């Protein structure tokens, strides 16, 4: 019932990440969990995002990319350990 | 020959703090203070709840320095043999930083037999409802859950304290804290540096 | 109905400090400046030597702060791939710490063109002492020490809105954000890596 | 010439050590390095002291392990790898 959102800058903020969403018609943002390095608390580049509406999740999957949050294209992808492993590896640049 | 009268040094460049023998200071056992939170995860259950109605938490801690053998010591309170906290605590909504501090100091310690705070030494922010706290606000965080502000509490020449029976008032010399986060945590253990700017006087 | 002006606070209780976008700052180049020393061990020799003639060594270093993405960045003089250092260095016997640092900034980052350049240095942020003629430095003087070999003092240097600087052709200049440095003794050293904290007390504005 | 003075407190400065031998009237001390914890700079409680006179070395070896520095009897020995270990065993 939840997704992953990545290819985000380390400065894309829960708040503004929300601005993007609301402005799709999706108004049920259930928590907003960013992934981060404990050492220094820096955004790992991807946040786990929840949503009660299992329809809007498509309204994001399709609509969120092709919008630009700070010149980067979002990457909404269903939750999964090989996406988990997909993003964790990407934060190594 | 004639020397010229030194000019006033801005406190921002030269802060001079008076330190006294740690032996000047003593404690009288007092009524034992429990902690408001019960288990290890009741504090965040409480943090969430408060942040909703109250908003971001504002914690403050006082750093009280004494000296022995020509080396600064910081007054910690331990309980078990593995737990050290600075005196302080949550502020009330709309309460002043310092005034509140005095209230907490006087609360946790303080003379029942009948506080100078002029300096800020640090800030620590807790981005989420979890353990880690940082000396800054990570760029992706807009609303941090807790703000911890630390002050240098200039101690009087002599003082009697009231250590709640369950606590132990110890005086930690700098080198015990330095580079020893495993022992005292990232805040406490970063005090030696945080204190180095002060020009200390060993009375 | 009318707003109350927030009166100023004591400098010792809240220091508001003005940060500007890295872009406000333009950075040219100048004559490659090699170190006054060379080869690891050699310096310590000189220190043993200087400690006799002049006495304890007095190093000063300035910490220049910019902000990007609402997050302070400390300007660092990189050298090679893994050597960073704060701009600064030794004072000359009997010299005002600050007039000396100023003199080291112009010396180290001076705008070749018009040298009418002033630094606002009004905050010391830490001291570090080197007990023996060795690497170790601690933010304090260990009980068993009377005559330290070197004293290092750091001053926050306030940049004005815009200003043009110049790097020695042999050096690169980076703007390390705080989290790069936090708990990163390996990458940046005991001193530099403790700046995040040492700056955490300043009230930063991001223009 | 060099020795190992130890079994002294971690606040026993160098000067106030020099002043202990200036009581035995030597004044030869050439160098004095201390042994400390790299991690925090604290004193391990013993130092290799450099002296320039073979003779006085006797005075040290012989005498001051009878003076009460800050309450401790200095433990003077020659500079040997097997001696060092007993001193660093005192850190523990």
Curated annotation (Swiss-Prot), chain A:
At what positions is Phosphothreonine found? 77
UniProt modification remark: Phosphorylated. Phosphorylated in the Arg/Ser-rich domain by SRPK1, in vitro. Symmetrically dimethylated on arginine residues in the GAR motif by PRMT5 in a WDR77- and CLNS1A-dependent manner. Asymmetrically dimethylated on arginine residues in the GAR motif by PRMT1.
Quaternary organization: Component of the cleavage factor Im (CFIm) complex which is a heterotetramer composed of two subunits of NUDT21/CPSF5 and two subunits of CPSF6 or CPSF7 or a heterodimer of CPSF6 and CPSF7. The cleavage factor Im (CFIm) complex associates with the CPSF and CSTF complexes to promote the assembly of the core mRNA 3'-processing machinery. Associates with the exon junction complex (EJC). Associates with the 80S ribosome particle. Interacts (via the RRM domain) with NUDT21/CPSF5; this interaction is direct and enhances binding to RNA. (Microbial infection) Interacts (via C-terminus) with HIV-1 capsid protein p24 (CA).
Q: Which cysteines are joined by disulfide bonds?
A: none
Full-protein residues shown here are 81 to 173 of 551
UniProt domain RRM: residue ranges: 1-81
Q: Where is this region: Necessary for nuclear paraspeckles localization?
A: 1-81
Which residue stretches belong to region Necessary for interaction with NUDT21/CPSF5? 1-81
Name the protein family: Belongs to the RRM CPSF6/7 family.
Task: Tell me the impact of changing residue 46 to A.
Answer: Increases affinity for UGUA RNA by 40%
State where the protein is found. Nucleus; Nucleus, Nucleoplasm; Nucleus speckle; Cytoplasm
Look up what happens after changing residue 48 to A. Reduces affinity for UGUA RNA by 40%
Q: What is known of its domains?
A: Contains an Arg/Ser-rich domain composed of arginine-serine dipeptide repeats within the C-terminal region that is necessary and sufficient for activating mRNA 3'-processing and alternative polyadenylation (APA).
This one is known as: Cleavage and polyadenylation specificity factor subunit 6
Curated annotation (Swiss-Prot), chain B:
A cellular component term from Gene Ontology for this protein is: paraspeckles
Q: How does it assemble?
A: Homodimer (via N- and C-terminus); binds RNA as homodimer. Component of the cleavage factor Im (CFIm) complex which is a heterotetramer composed of two subunits of NUDT21/CPSF5 and two subunits of CPSF6 or CPSF7 or a heterodimer of CPSF6 and CPSF7. The cleavage factor Im (CFIm) complex associates with the CPSF and CSTF complexes to promote the assembly of the core mRNA 3'-processing machinery. Interacts with CPSF6 (via the RRM domain); this interaction is direct and enhances binding to RNA. Interacts with CPSF7. Interacts with FIP1L1; this interaction occurs in a RNA sequence-specific manner.
Effect of altering residue 130 to A?
A: Reduces affinity for UGUA RNA by 50%
Q: Which keywords fit this entry according to its UniProt record?
A: Acetylation, Cytoplasm, Differentiation, Methylation, mRNA processing, Nucleus, Phosphoprotein, RNA-binding
GO process terms (BP):
cell differentiation; co-transcriptional mRNA 3'-end processing, cleavage and polyadenylation pathway; mRNA 3'-end processing; mRNA alternative polyadenylation; mRNA processing; positive regulation of pro-B cell differentiation; positive regulation of stem cell differentiation; post-transcriptional regulation of gene expression
- Sorted alphabetically, which CDD domains does this protein's record hold? NUDIX_Cfim25_Nudt21
The record's InterPro entries line, in alphabetical order, gives: Cleav_polyA_spec_factor_su5, NUDIX_hydrolase-like_dom_sf, NUDIX_hydrolase_dom
Q: Which tissues does the record link to its expression?
A: Expressed in the heart, brain, placenta, lung, liver, skeletal muscle, kidney and pancreas.
UniProt PTM: Acetylated mainly by p300/CBP, recruited to the complex by CPSF6. Acetylation decreases interaction with PAPAO. Deacetylated by the class I/II HDACs, HDAC1, HDAC3 and HDAC10, and by the class III HDACs, SIRT1 and SIRT2.
GO MF annotation terms: chromatin binding; histone deacetylase binding; identical protein binding; mRNA 3'-UTR AU-rich region binding; mRNA binding; protein homodimerization activity; RNA binding
Which residues carry the post-translational modification Phosphotyrosine, per the record?
A: 20
- Sequence intervals crossing the membrane: none
Curated annotation (Swiss-Prot), chain D:
Outcome recorded upon mutating residue 31 to A: Reduces affinity for UGUA RNA by 85%
Residue positions, PTM Phosphothreonine: 77
Post-translational modification as stated in the protein's UniProt record:
Phosphorylated. Phosphorylated in the Arg/Ser-rich domain by SRPK1, in vitro.
Coiled coil region boundaries:
none
Q: Which residue ranges are recorded for the region named Necessary for interaction with NUDT21/CPSF5?
A: 1-81
**Transmembrane stretches, start-end:** none
Give the consequence of mutating residue 48 to A: Reduces affinity for UGUA RNA by 40%
> Which subcellular locations apply to this protein?
Nucleus; Nucleus, Nucleoplasm; Nucleus speckle; Cytoplasm
Consequence of changing residue 4 to A: Reduces affinity for UGUA RNA by 40%
In residue numbers, the region (Necessary for nuclear paraspeckles localization) covers 1-81
Specify the superkingdom. Answer: Eukaryota
Q: Show where the RRM domain sits.
A: 1-81
| Free-text comment about domains | Contains an Arg/Ser-rich domain composed of arginine-serine dipeptide repeats within the C-terminal region that is necessary and sufficient for activating mRNA 3'-processing and alternative polyadenylation (APA).
Q: What binding partners and quaternary form does the record give? A: Component of the cleavage factor Im (CFIm) complex which is a heterotetramer composed of two subunits of NUDT21/CPSF5 and two subunits of CPSF6 or CPSF7 or a heterodimer of CPSF6 and CPSF7. The cleavage factor Im (CFIm) complex associates with the CPSF and CSTF complexes to promote the assembly of the core mRNA 3'-processing machinery. Associates with the exon junction complex (EJC). Associates with the 80S ribosome particle. Interacts (via the RRM domain) with NUDT21/CPSF5; this interaction is direct and enhances binding to RNA. (Microbial infection) Interacts (via C-terminus) with HIV-1 capsid protein p24 (CA).
Family, according to the entry, reads as follows: Belongs to the RRM CPSF6/7 family.
Which protein is depicted?
Cleavage and polyadenylation specificity factor subunit 6
Q: Which organism is it from?
A: Homo sapiens (Human)
């Amino acid at each position: 019932i939840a997704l992953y959102i990545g290819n985000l800058t380390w400065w894309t903020t829960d708040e503004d990440l929300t601005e993007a969403v609301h402005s799709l018609g999706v108004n049920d943002i259930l928590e907003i969990k960013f992934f981060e390095n404990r050492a220094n608390g820096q955004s790992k580049g991807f946040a786990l995002v929840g949503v009660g509406s299992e329809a809007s999740s498509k309204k994001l999957m399709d609509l969120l990319p092709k919008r630009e949050l700070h010149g980067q294209n979002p990457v909404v992808t269903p939750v999964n350990k090989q996406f988990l492993s997909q993003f964790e590896m990407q934060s190594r640049k | 020959g004639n020397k010229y009268i030194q000019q006033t040094k801005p406190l921002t460049l030269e802060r001079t703090i008076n330190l006294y023998p740690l032996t000047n200071y003593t404690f009288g056992t007092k009524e034992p203070l429990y902690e408001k939170d019960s288990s290890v995860a009741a504090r965040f259950q409480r943090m969430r709840e408060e942040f909703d109605k109250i908003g971001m938490r504002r914690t403050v801690e006082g750093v009280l320095i004494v000296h022995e053998h020509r080396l600064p010591h910081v007054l910690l309170l331990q309980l078990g043999t593995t737990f050290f906290k600075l005196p302080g605590g949550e502020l009330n909504p709309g309460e002043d930083e310092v005034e509140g501090l005095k209230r907490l100091m006087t609360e946790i310690l303080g003379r029942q037999d009948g506080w100078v705070i002029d300096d800020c030494i640090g800030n620590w922010w807790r981005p989420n409802f979890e353990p880690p706290q940082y000396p800054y606000i990570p760029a992706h965080i807009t609303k941090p859950k807790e703000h911890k502000k630390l002050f240098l509490v200039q101690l009087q020449e002599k003082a009697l304290f009231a250590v709640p029976k369950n606590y132990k008032l110890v005086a930690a010399p700098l080198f015990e804290l330095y580079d020893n986060a495993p022992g005292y945590g990232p805040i406490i253990s970063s005090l030696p540096q945080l204190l180095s700017r002060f020009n200390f006087i060993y009375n």
